[PDB]
């Protein structure tokens, strides 16, 4: 889901390694240093790309993921491991969450949602309605799966024209 | 209300991903540091965050501490400027913010006088005093605003101001 | 400039003490994770009870910028006003001057006293041939009071220091 | 004080022949009828009277109720209009009533600005802000009146008033 902060890239892995082995190594490693923040294994899963010698580590919690960053250079089967953040990682989470204002009220979820998907699929979206009436308040929020579309979308939507309202689109912040 | 929602606050624009306990720790810490806690112990008992709509509610142990916290409106929490407000189901004792309006030209009516007041925000109540025999204005009126913080905005924008040959007087009726 | 490690604080509660003030900000900083290392960011606090304002000194430029996020914060019930000092320069050395054309025989003092003719200097240095130790004919300086800079340029630039017209301009 | 004389009041112009018992019974009864009491029992514990100089002192069981009885000032008792004031040893904590003064012709000095101020009463504090490099008025000042009450009198008589080609602003600094 929102766990780009729950995964880690592992380069230079030894040849032959299995996902299980890697999994053990890091769980064992996390223990020796007391990097663990609870009983049980911090690493849920490991996916290996045998051809390009790399893999990803799936952690159960954020902090324990940040903690594993300290294993960069660590030795596994006589080879120095390379540890890095995934590329999707956002140190400042939600920084690309958009705000869509000036939405004519007659427009509904799917309508406004469609207006947005023009630039691509969303990972999140919600149109604010009045808890009482159930009607729309004229503003929404979304976040694009591909984070680099936020600027494309703003470019095409900010200032657009719908009915009599002037759409305001920017980062929610 | 008229007595509910006295120990809760709305917290908008919370940090994305923030936990409830974290939220709680931040506010309790501020209560001490800012010197708003009135007694030993945590002023904040619980935090209810709403993921999808990105907002939260704080639950305070006492009524007074709940009001003190209002002073945190705008406080920065992990880069985010917190929006602190009263629960919508909240509301103060009527006439708590009643306003007195003096220095109005007697020829003006309720709508003309109401139009100068409504430009600041909606009115929950309003009345222009008139001689019951003639129905002619006496030059002064009372009113209260739905949102009660518009009260000071109307005061700041109208009190002491010039309107005709007179100098408007706008203040809390008390 | 150290005015990049100082901040102004207004509306301080009556009777507050420099210690009380120092603990507050060092704690506010720690609470927000605005700290860039271990220890306290605030090194000291200066209080003027009469005009009820204060000055906080920090150990780093970043943290100083980081504390700007404390404007409107509550301390003893009262809201604090945090602002940058007036002698603040978002642009580090945009008033650093170049004094070229200096006669080939003058030295620090000789060249300095001429510059202090418009005010005290925060920084100065005469360029010399590291080996011969001989003057290269140009110097750089900066006035403690950055507002004199233009008056000094108006005053010196083009002056006749014996056998050549002095050149004074912002070194930028 | 800084904290003494917190539960006492001076009562002038008292009825002649009046007893301590009667005076006590009057205020206690008033605290109840006017809904000023805050707990079962009597807010007024004792009354000391000075027959010759015609005054008395009320002693309250609490700090808040004493402050409340302040509202009875001018109340008529057996024909007499009572003078309710605070003990002279009683002192408000500084800054409580500090006033801000804006809209001042930046060419005036301390004495000239105070002259207009002290016309409402004596100042126990005063300062006109001046550029430290030039020593020139910034056009605004702070001050505090010795007699706390003069505060709402300077405000009513100076706030929003005109002084030259400008409009004065006078209000508590809080």
Q: Can you give the CATH number for the domain in which B19 is found? A: 3.30.70.330
Which of D71, D152, D159, D160 would you mutate first to test chain B, the one with the most B CBs within 10 A? D160
Please give the angle made by the CA atoms of C17, C19 and C21, to the nearest 5 degrees: 70
Q: What does residue D25 show for φ and ψ, rounded to 5 degrees?
A: -65, -30
Which chain B residues have a beta carbon less than 8 Å from that of C75?
A: 33-35
Contact A158, A99 (CB under 8 A): no
**DSSP at D49:** E
C-alpha dist (Å) from residue A100 to A142, A154, A157, A163, D141 = 8, 9, 9, 15, 46
Hey, are the CB atoms on D95 and C14 less than 8 Å from each other?
A: yes
**DSSP at C146:** T
Characterize the bridge pairing of strands C135-143 and D76-77: unpaired
Min Cα separation A151/chain B (Å)? 20
Nearest Cα to B95, choosing from B169, B151, B139? B151
Whether residue A64 sits in one domain with residue A117: no
- Other Cβ atoms less than 10 A from the Cβ of C34: the count is 21
Whether residue D78 sits in one domain with residue D119: no
Whether residue B80 sits in one domain with residue B111: no
**DSSP at C117:** B
Q: What's the number of CA atoms in the CB half-sphere (13 Å) around residue B84? A: 20
Summarize chain C as % helix, strand, coil (round to 5). 25, 30, 45
DSSP C130-142: TTT--EEEEEEEE
Long-range contacts made by residues D34-38, C-beta under 8 angstroms, separation at least 24? Answer: D34/D71, D34/D72, D36/D65, D36/D68, D36/D69, D36/D71, D37/D65, D38/D62, D38/D64, D38/D65, D38/D68
Nearest Cα to B101, choosing from B148, B39, B18, B163? B163
- Say whether B57 sits in a helix, a strand or coil: strand
Q: Note the helical H segments in A6-51.
A: 19-32
Q: What does residue D27 show for φ and ψ, rounded to 5 degrees?
A: -65, -45
Which of C21, C26, C27, C72 would you mutate first to test chain B, the one with the most B CBs within 10 A? C72
Whether residue B21 sits in one domain with residue B32: yes
Contact A136, A129 (CB under 8 A): yes
As for how many domains chain C has, the answer is 2
Whether residue C42 sits in one domain with residue C5: yes
Hey, are the CB atoms on C76 and B34 less than 8 Å from each other?
A: yes
B158 preceded by a cis bond (ω within 30 of 0): no
Whether residue A54 sits in one domain with residue A34: yes
Question: What is the torsional sign of CA B151, B157, B162, B167?
Answer: positive
Which of D92, D95, D125, D172 would you mutate first to test chain C, the one with the most C CBs within 10 A? D95
In this complex, which chains have at least 3 CB pairs below 8 Å with chain B?
A, C, D
- Other Cβ atoms less than 10 A from the Cβ of C114: the count is 19
Residues of B at the C interface, defined by Cβ within 8 angstroms: 26, 29-30, 33-36, 68, 71-72, 74-78
Nearest Cα to B85, choosing from B9, B148, B18, B146? B9
C-alpha dist (Å) from residue B139 to A85, B127, B129, B131, B136 = 71, 11, 7, 10, 9
Whether residue C67 sits in one domain with residue C53: yes
Whether residue A80 sits in one domain with residue A24: yes
Whether residue D138 sits in one domain with residue D68: no
Contact B161, B101 (CB under 8 A): no
Min Cα separation D124/chain C (Å)? 13
Q: Which of D47, D66, D93 is the last residue of a domain?
A: D93
Which of B10, B12, B17, B18 would you mutate first to test chain A, the one with the most A CBs within 10 A? B17
Hey, are the CB atoms on B53 and A93 less than 8 Å from each other?
A: no
CA–CA separation, B153 vs C85, rounded Å?
31
Q: Which of B43, B60, B93 is the last residue of a domain?
A: B93
Residues of B at the A interface, defined by Cβ within 8 angstroms: 13, 16-17, 52-54, 79-80
Question: What is the torsional sign of CA B148, B152, B157, B163?
Answer: positive
C56 forms beta bridges with C7, C45
Q: Which of B93, B108, B130 is the last residue of a domain?
A: B93
Whether residue D101 sits in one domain with residue D170: yes
Min Cα separation D125/chain C (Å)? 10
CA–CA separation, B13 vs B21, rounded Å?
17
Closest chain A residue to the Cα of B54, Cα to Cα: A141
Closest chain D residue to the Cα of B158, Cα to Cα: D160
Hey, are the CB atoms on A128 and B53 less than 8 Å from each other?
A: yes
Name, in order, each residue with C-beta under 8 angstroms of C150's C-beta and a sequence gap of 6 or more.
Answer: none
CA–CA separation, B16 vs A90, rounded Å?
12
Burial of A163 from C-beta contacts in 10 A (0-12 / 13-18 / 19+): exposed
C-alpha dist (Å) from residue C30 to A127, C71, C143 = 37, 16, 36
Whether residue B22 sits in one domain with residue B78: yes
Contact A83, A29 (CB under 8 A): no
Hey, are the CB atoms on B79 and A94 less than 8 Å from each other?
A: no
Contact A65, A36 (CB under 8 A): no
Nearest Cα to D47, choosing from D35, D38, D59, D63? D59
Experimental method reported for this structure: X-ray
CA–CA separation, A59 vs A61, rounded Å?
6
Q: Which of C70, C76, C79 is the closest to B35 by Cβ?
A: C76
CA–CA separation, D120 vs D157, rounded Å?
9
Which chain B residues have a beta carbon less than 8 Å from that of D159?
A: 160
Residues of D at the C interface, defined by Cβ within 8 angstroms: 93-95, 127, 129
Closest chain C residue to the Cα of D126, Cα to Cα: C50
C-alpha dist (Å) from residue A88 to A48, A172, B155 = 18, 19, 52
Closest chain C residue to the Cα of B28, Cα to Cα: C31
Q: What is the span of the domain harbouring residue C140?
A: 91-146
CA–CA separation, D23 vs D12, rounded Å?
12
Whether residue A72 sits in one domain with residue A154: yes
Contact A145, A123 (CB under 8 A): yes
């Amino acid at each position: 889901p929102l766990g780009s902060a729950r995964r880690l890239y592992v380069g230079n892995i030894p040849f032959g390694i299995t996902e299980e082995a890697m999994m053990d190594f890091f769980n064992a490693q996390m223990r020796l240093g007391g990097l663990t923040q609870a009983p049980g294994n911090p690493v849920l899963a490991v996916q290996i790309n045998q051809d390009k010698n790399f893999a990803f580590l799936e952690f159960r919690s954020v902090d324990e993921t940040t903690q594993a960053m300290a294993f960069d250079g660590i030795i596994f089967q006589g080879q120095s491991l390379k540890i890095r953040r995934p590329h999707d990682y956002q140190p400042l989470p939600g920084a690309h969450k958009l705000f869509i204002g000036g939405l004519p009220n007659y427009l509904n979820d799917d309508q406004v949602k469609e207006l947005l998907t023009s630039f691509g699929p969303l990972k999140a979206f919600n149109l604010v309605k009045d808890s009482a009436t159930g009607l729309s308040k004229g503003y929404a929020f979304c976040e694009y799966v591909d984070i680099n579309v936020t600027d494309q979308a703003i470019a095409g939507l900010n200032g657009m024209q719908l009915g009599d309202k002037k759409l305001l689109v920017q980062r929610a912040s």
